[PDB]
Amino acid sequence: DGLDATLVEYQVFDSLRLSTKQFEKKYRIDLMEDRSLSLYMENSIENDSSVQDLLDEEYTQLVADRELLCKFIFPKGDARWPLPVNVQRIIQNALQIFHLEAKKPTDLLPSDIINGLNELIAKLTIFRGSDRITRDVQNNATLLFQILLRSKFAVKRVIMEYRLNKVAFEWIMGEVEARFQQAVVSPGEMVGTLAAQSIGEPATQMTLNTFHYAGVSSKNVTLGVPRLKEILNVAKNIKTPSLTIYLMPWIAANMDLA
Amino acid sequence: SGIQFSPSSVPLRRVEEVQFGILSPEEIRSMSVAKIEFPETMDESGQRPRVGGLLDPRLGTIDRQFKCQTCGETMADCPGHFGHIELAKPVFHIGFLSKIKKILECVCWNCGKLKIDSSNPKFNDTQRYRDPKNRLNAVWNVCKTKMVCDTGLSAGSDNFDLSNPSANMGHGGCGAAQPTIRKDGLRLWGSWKRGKDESDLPEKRLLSPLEVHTIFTHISSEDLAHLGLNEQYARPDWMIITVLPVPPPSVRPSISVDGTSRGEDDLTHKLSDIIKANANVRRCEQEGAPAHIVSEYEQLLQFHVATYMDNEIAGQPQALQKSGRPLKSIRARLKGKEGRLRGNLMGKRVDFSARTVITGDPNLSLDELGVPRSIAKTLTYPETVTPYNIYQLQELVRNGPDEHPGAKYIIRDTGERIDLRYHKRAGDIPLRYGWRVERHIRDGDVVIFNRQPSLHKMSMMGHRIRVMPYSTFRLNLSVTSPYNADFDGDEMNMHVPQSEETRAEIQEITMVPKQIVSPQSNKPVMGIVQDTLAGVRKFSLRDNFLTRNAVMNIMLWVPDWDGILPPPVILKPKVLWTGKQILSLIIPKGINLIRDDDKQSLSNPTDSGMLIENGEIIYGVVDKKTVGASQGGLVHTIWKEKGPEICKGFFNGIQRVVNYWLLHNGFSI
Amino acid sequence: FFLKELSLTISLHPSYFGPRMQDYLKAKLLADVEGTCSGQYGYIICVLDSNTIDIDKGRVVPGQGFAEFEVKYRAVLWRPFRGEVVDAIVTTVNKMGFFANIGPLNVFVSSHLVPPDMKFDPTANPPNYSGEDQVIEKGSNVRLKIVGTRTDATEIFAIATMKEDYLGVL
Amino acid sequence: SGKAVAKEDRTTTPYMTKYERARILGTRALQISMNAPVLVDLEGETDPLQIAMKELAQKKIPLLVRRYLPDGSYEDWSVAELI
Amino acid sequence: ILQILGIEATRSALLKELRNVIEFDGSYVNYRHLALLCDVMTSRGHLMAITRHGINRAETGALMRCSFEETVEILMDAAASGEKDDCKGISENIMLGQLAPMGTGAFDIYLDQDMLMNYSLGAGSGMGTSQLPEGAGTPYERSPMVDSG
Amino acid sequence: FEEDAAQLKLGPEFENEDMLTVSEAKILIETVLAQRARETNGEIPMTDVMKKTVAYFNVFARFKTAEATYACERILGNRFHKFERAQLGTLCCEDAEEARTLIPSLANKIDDQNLQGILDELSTL
Amino acid sequence: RMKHGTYDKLEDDGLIAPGTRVSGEDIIIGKTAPIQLHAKRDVSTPLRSTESGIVDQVMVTTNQEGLKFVKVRMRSTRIPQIGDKFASRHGQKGTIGMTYRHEDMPFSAQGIVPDIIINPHAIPSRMTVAHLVE
Amino acid sequence: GGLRFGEMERDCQISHGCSSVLRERLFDCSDAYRVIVCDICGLIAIASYKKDSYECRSCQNRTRFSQVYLPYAAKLLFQELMSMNIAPRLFTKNHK
Incomplete structure (x- = not known):
């Protein structure tokens, strides 16, 4: 990750377990019998001015879309993962600090929120510096944290859901930047000692349970703690040597074929 | 770092590298400045003096009234003065002996020239294709296949060199060698065959030390390096002892049944027994007679100088000193256990510490720890004399070491301790303006508190003393989870820092506050638990209204009160306050939560779920779900916005407000 | 220097x-x-x-x-x-040698390292070592050739001779 | 084998580390505790450290930090520089 | 798995096989520390076990090992070879009392004399009693030059 | 280990260094003192080492002047052997044969004629 | 040698007389072992400071051996103080946390006052319904 | 006294990261012991810390020296090693 375990909050990717059909109904935008946002563009529409805007809107989604396909292609199905800096919260409370309800439409501009990020994701650096190519380890040492910030701050999102204004948004992207760099671990430090200790406590919590009471059982048998030593000892004789093999199907998805 | 007789002199420069070498007879002699000819020394001169070659010369002193020339004073500050113990009787050496035995075939006797040739270019090259201290494997393999010599070195023939000559073959010249060896008890035996005319197998035929050493010394310098040896630190010709060194008493022990008596250890003693067996062997040098019987007593030095190292080298020696019991060797102390290694180098007792039974207290801030005066009156905690202290700091001394707000000891320029006890107890002795003075402890004043067994990062975290009475450690209930230990009469240790540079570490990094969230799980590790928790539920209910009558009373905890009395939720006939109202008071301003539990509807539907706004709850009911180490836990959420404190105050408010509510709400089963 | x-x-x-x-x-x-x-x-x-x-x-x-x-x-x-030639300033003259002095270092010229032409005179007004017209008293810088030097306790001390040509009274 | 690094081309993080704060405050503490030239208007304190903290807040405290790299090179940072 | 898949493969195997040890059920998991244990195991090729002693390695001299216990032999053998210990160790280090590189000891400090020098503001006399004179430093006198000559 | 006389032999660092001159050395010392006095209260203990030098230096003023030294420098030039140089300017007088005797390390280092010319210039200086 | 006595509490017999208020590192017996002004040693036993209180009684008899033989016993009342252990007969290991005077405690309504009061959370988890029944 | 600072215990400072607390509660608050080491062969000298007399009857040293902080704990071991004919040379900084 690059971050200090201790400053982190499991988070959720709205943009994942979503049907493509509803995905489009959250981020994508067009002039095709739509133009519903103009009802929010208040105050000030343009309107539509000259190109540019129409173009930013499909370019945002080119990348918000290269993120929907990958993941997956990497993550099984789960969605809850632990990231640094609770974003889902910096926005509430944030709609407490400034409030403003649907009645007040956004004093923002689609050409700002998109610059907003690009300027304040590139402020989230943890590997310094450039030193060309050394900017690569960094571009994707935060790549995950990144797809969040294009999913909870992509355009259609900030005007349909939770209308923001220059001041609010400018302050949101404030805390993020700050809470991020305040979450970068070390140097120091001792990441093994502390980590090792935490790994020991967990085992102790299992050992007992894996035995507690507790039967009595069959198949899949293996046990916990009592096994640990087996793994660390890489010993050949590991009681339950088990091994799980999957299939296709076919074969199979059936049964009698299996 | 403290003081140490303002040695000054040789600046300081901390140890940076550690060079592990192999003592050498020559060096051992030079280093030592004593003799040691009175084997059965022990001041056995007929009086209570000493000499010559045991106690005195010099050596390092053993009591006060003594300035053992060379340094001082005593008993400390004066390290032991090692000394040589001649010999003149080729002695063995178990430990290093094992290795020397394995070698056999690394030079062949006596020409002393690496076995390999050139060579055989693979064998020799292969052995080198491995870092030092390992190539041994190759040597051993060659010895097992060796047992004969050849021509004579690689001397041209034909003679030439440009670039030559090769001109060689092989492995020098001589013969051998030719006889292997095996280990039988504490003796070496080997057979000599060819053959087919007369030889010997495995039955007898020993060797000796004087012979081996001689062969080694002859070893070629470019040869000493060819193997895992060091022609500067480690030299085979060193494996054999000749000037056996003698550590200073400082390393040994003594005793004195004051009076009449004063036996020693024990131990050592044996050392004297060895010189007894050496001086009786050295004097016979002019003989001669019986000669063949003289070797029988020589075998005894082979055993004693061993028992002194490895009591039981797996041979069946006994090494009985008193009542047939192993003779406390040197290898015994090292890797006990029950000694150094894991008792004098890893886990050392220590000082400026204390421990006692713990007790609960609901009235201390989280980062607070009740320290009984009994202890506070015995700690410290030096503290140099600042120009800001002189007046304040002086009052302490003039007070006394028996009055909490007092001190013990006053340290001066020269490094002299003016014990405030019986010693001082007077002498205005104003107070220097650069010296040091040791005070009692008083008000956080941080100090670190742990619980054996300390698994988690936070079994040692740092509190702020002060200072209560009664002889236990009062500590804060919400801090009990991290110490996985109740009040079953448990003990917990306290370690007080001294230097003002650690006082800083355990304040800025380690602190009950900055430790309320271990990264083990990026989840909190402390939370509202026990009675203050049971209480929250039974009070966060919207069935519980508060009489105007207090409210008031309970508002005196917060502890940082706006001063403003909360706007009443009920203006009907009586003025009433909801239990959620005044509770949401002790939560920070501007933290949001949308708990959304199982069944939950646009409705209430029935205090189900939980949800806070500008630091005020409005929805559902507080329980462990939210004021315990939960994931998106309320405890987690202000920590983490906005850091410990008012964060640290959260535990003080609820754990103070509610306890206060519960006091007059009563609860039981 | x-x-x-x-x-x-x-x-x-x-x-x-x-x-x-x-x-x-x-x-x-x-x-x-x-x-x-x-x-x-x-x-x-x-x-x-x-x-x-x-x-x-x-x-x-x-x-x-x-x-x-x-x-x-x-x-x-x-x-x-050792081997360096320096001008020195005689301080004392005793039947034991010549206690010269160069700068801050003290040089001792053992009598055994002095020519046989310089007999020692203790009766002469001020103890000296004449010959040989040439008179070396407590006020005559001589030329010597350091024969050996020593360093005991940061301090240095060596002995000089007058045996070679072009050495002696200055 | 050191190497020293350019006060102009610094690599490491511009912010002051959890551990450093702890070491600096530890270091000045001892300094002042040892009667030393205090670099900010004495608020009227007593605690050689609680004072050092008054300094840190105003970034008016001497001491610099040499950050050794694995290479063997280093970087020097000024308390007023750091964050 | 190391013999028949990848070495990288086998790391993932550990990570997975450790999760399945401390998770069922309800267990304090952090992907970070789990991650680290694995990389340490599969970071030198072969599968370095962690038996009561500490990865049966040997590349940081003895001094260090002597800490993992049991000492003895180690020193009795290493001595016969003069094994240099860069003392870059952390237990080797807490053995000598030199300050250890434990995070907050993994850096040194100096002094920003520069600040004390130019430090906020803020002359040339010598006759108010001191028989000696002066005048700032320009009464007609040089230096170096002569030295160079 | 190294306790010879030579013949130019001994410590390497010292050999490398250039042997300071007598008169010039004293001049530099004087200069140094002047720079120190530039703002002194009065006194400045000269210890015991100073006294001796102050005497020997004055009793060997082979150039009682600020220019004498420069003249000497001008006259010289070719290094040859720092030691030998400072030695030749510290002894003085006079003939070749004598030069070799005092500095045997000069053997086949330099000729004669030249030497004589230098001595004459010094005597007149 | 021996300081921080005081031996001012020993009789002519070199032994203490009950029941003399003994505290601190006070001493109670005195020894002597030969070796100007020489020579008398001191192999006498003091009293651990951690203890206090008076002296119940002493018994001086003869051993064989063939010399004298003394035994000293001192009593030291001990009151309950915060931090002492108590537990019922069901494994309710408890320790004292506080000592409220009579008024504070829930005087009710009979009205008596609890002599000690344990907390309800030491029930449901340690299931010890016997403590209740009793 | 005293108390007891377990292996367990020490492994926990390291987690936080307290170089100085650690060093304080092991090489100061228990065995505050200083010794003087020869720069060539790193061993105990004939030190006096009074008359500035150090000297070395072996390496023949009297000017080249350095000081070291070690626990009398350490001290013993190095000494106990001398009896086994092995020399832990404490080659300090450049003083090597």
Whole structure:
């Protein structure tokens, strides 16, 4: 990750377990019998001015879309993962600090929120510096944290859901930047000692349970703690040597074929 | 770092590298400045003096009234003065002996020239294709296949060199060698065959030390390096002892049944027994007679100088000193256990510490720890004399070491301790303006508190003393989870820092506050638990209204009160306050939560779920779900916005407000 | 005499951090090295303070509160070596030899290392060693050829002879 | 084998580390505790450290930090520089 | 798995096989520390076990090992070879009392004399008693030059 | 280890260094003192080492002047052997044969004629 | 040698007389072992400071051996103080946390006052319904 | 006294990261012991810390020296090693 375990909050990717059909109904935008946002563009529409805007809107989604396909292609199905800096919260409370309800439409501009990020994701650096190519380890040492910030701050999102204004948004992207760099671990430090200790406590919590009471059982048998030593000892004789093999199907998805 | 007789002199420069070498007879002699000819020394001169070659010369002193020339004073500050113990009787050496035995075939006797040739270019090259201290494997393999010599070195023939000559073959010249060896008890035996005319197998035929050493010394310098040896630190010709060194008493022990008596250890003693067996062997040098019987007593030095190292080298020696019991060797102390290694180098007792039974207290801030005066009156905690202290700091001394707000000891320029006890107890002795003075402890004043067994990062975290009475450690209930230990009469240790540079570490990094969230799980590790928790539920209910009558009373905890009395939720006939109202008071301003539990509807539907706004709850009911180490836990959420404190105050408010509510709400089963 | 570059560490104390440390460090250096002697470099006549005074570092001590300031300086030193010819100033004359004196170092000319033409006269007004018109009293710089030098306790001491040609009274 | 690094081309993080704060405050504490030239208007304190903290807040405290790299090179940072 | 898949493969195997040890059920998991244990195991090729002693390695001299216990032999053998210990160790280090590189000991400190020098503001006399004179420093005198000559 | 006389032999660092001159050395010392006095209260203990030097230096003033030294420098030039140089300017007088005797290391280092010319210039200086 | 007595509490017999208020590192017996002004040693036993209180009684008899033989016993009342252990007969290991005077405690309504009061959370988890029944 | 600072215990400072607390509660608050080491062969000298007399009857040293902080704990071991004919040379900084 690059971050200090201790400053982190499991988070959720709205943009994942979503049907493509509803995905489009959250981020994508067009002039095709739509133009519903103009009802929010208040105050000030343009309107539509000259190109540019129409173009930013499909370019945002080119990348918000290269993120929907990958993941997956990497993550099984789960969605809850632990990231640094609770974003889902910096926005509430944030709609407490400034409030403003649907009645007040956004004093923002689609050409700002998109610059907003690009300027304040590139402020989230943890590997310094450039030193060309050394900017690569960094571009994707935060790549995950990144797809969040294009999913909870992509355009259609900030005007349909939770209308923001220059001041609010400018302050949101404030805390993020700050809470991020305040979450970068070390140097120091001792990441093994502390980590090792935490790994020991967990085992102790299992050992007992894996035995507690507790039967009595069959198949899949293996046990916990009592096994640990087996793994660390890489010993050949590991009681339950088990091994799980999957299939296709076919074969199979059936049964009698299996 | 403290003081140490303002040695000054040789600046300081901390140890940076550690060079592990192999003592050498020559060096051992030079280093030592004593003799040691009175084997059965022990001041056995007929009086209570000493000499010559045991106690005195010099050596390092053993009591006060003594300035053992060379340094001082005593008993400390004066390290032991090692000394040589001649010999003149080729002695063995178990430990290093094992290795020397394995070698056999690394030079062949006596020409002393690496076995390999050139060579055989693979064998020799292969052995080198491995870092030092390992190539041994190759040597051993060659010895097992060796047992004969050849021509004579690689001397041209034909003679030439440009670039030559090769001109060689092989492995020098001589013969051998030719006889292997095996280990039988504490003796070496080997057979000599060819053959087919007369030889010997495995039955007898020993060797000796004087012979081996001689062969080694002859070893070629470019040869000493060819193997895992060091022609500067480690030299085979060193494996054999000749000037056996003698550590200073400082390393040994003594005793004195004051009076009449004063036996020693024990131990050592044996050392004297060895010189007894050496001086009786050295004097016979002019003989001669019986000669063949003289070797029988020589075998005894082979055993004693061993028992002194490895009591039981797996041979069946006994090494009985008193009542047939192993003779406390040197290898015994090292890797006990029950000694150094894991008792004098890893886990050392220590000082400026204390421990006692713990007790609960609901009235201390989280980062607070009740320290009984009994202890506070015995700690410290030096503290140099600042120009800001002189007046304040002086009052302490003039007070006394028996009055909490007092001190013990006053340290001066020269490094002299003016014990405030019986010693001082007077002498205005104003107070220097650069010296040091040791005070009692008083008000956080941080100090670190742990619980054996300390698994988690936070079994040692740092509190702020002060200072209560009664002889236990009062500590804060919400801090009990991290110490996985109740009040079953448990003990917990306290370690007080001294230097003002650690006082800083355990304040800025380690602190009950900055430790309320271990990264083990990026989840909190402390939370509202026990009675203050049971209480929250039974009070966060919207069935519980508060009489105007207090409210008031309970508002005196917060502890940082706006001063403003909360706007009443009920203006009907009586003025009433909801239990959620005044509770949401002790939560920070501007933290949001949308708990959304199982069944939950646009409705209430029935205090189900939980949800806070500008630091005020409005929805559902507080329980462990939210004021315990939960994931998106309320405890987690202000920590983490906005850091410990008012964060640290959260535990003080609820754990103070509610306890206060519960006091007059009563609860039981 | 040599003009060389030497090193020395100054261990300063918090009390003297002020805003003019540089001065303190320099003042402390002059005091610790000037007048000292070593077998390695000899007598440290004086330090060429100013311009030729480098002040690097420094790193404060963990358990001490004092910072170590390494200093590179140019100094005038007087180191003698066996075989060197020097002019000396006779101080005393006893039937034991000639207690000369060169600069700050003391040179002893054993009587056995003096020509057989210089008989010792104790009756003469002021004990001297004449011959041989040439009269060497407690006021006549002589030329000697260091035969051997020694260094016991930073201090240096060697013996000179008068056996070679062109040595003796000056 | 050191190497020293350019006060102009610094690599490491511009912010002051959890551990450093702890070491600096530890270091000045001892310094002042040892009667030393205090670099900010004395608020009227007593605690050689609680004072050092008054300094840190105003970034008016001496001492610099040499950050050794694995290479063997280092970087020097000024308390007023750091964050 | 190391013999028949990848070495990288086998790391993932550990990570997975450790999760399945401390998770069922309800267990304090952090992907970070789990991650680290694995990389340490599969970071030198072969599968370095962690038996009561500490990865049966040997590349940091003895001094260090002597800490993992049991000492003895180690020193009795290493001595016969003069094994240099860069003392870059952390237990080797807490053995000598030198300050250890434990995070907050993994850096040194000096002094920003520069600040004390130019420090906020803020003359040339010598006759108010001190028989000696002065005048700032320009009464007609040089230096160097002569030295160079 | 190294305790010879030579013949130019001994410590390497010292060998490398250039042997300061007598008169010139004293001049430099004087200069140094002048720079120090530039703002002194009065006194400045000269210890014991100073006294001796102050005497020997004055009793060997082979150039009681600020220019004498420069003249000497001008006259010289070719290094040859720092030691030998400072030695030749510290002894003086006079003939070749004598030069070799005092500095045997000069053997086949330099000729004669030249030497004589230098001595004459010094005597007149 | 021996300081921080005081031996001012020993009789002519070199032994203490009950029941003399003994505290601190006070001493109670005195020894002597031969070796100007020489020589008398001191192999006498003091009293651990951690203890206090008076002296119940002493018994001086003869051993064989063939010399004298003394035994000293001192009593030291001990009151309950915060931090002392108590537990019922069901494994309710408890320790004292506080000592409220009579008024504070829930005087009710009979009205008596609890002599000690344990907390309800030491029930449901340690299922010890016997403590209740009793 | 005293108390007891377990292996367990020490492994926990390291987790936080307290170089100085650690060093304080092991090489100061228990065995505050200082010794003087020869720069060539790193061993105990004939030190006096009074008359500045150090000297070395072996390496023949009298000018080249350095000081070291070690626990009398350490001290013993190095000494106990001398009896086994092995020399832990404490080659300090450049003083090597």
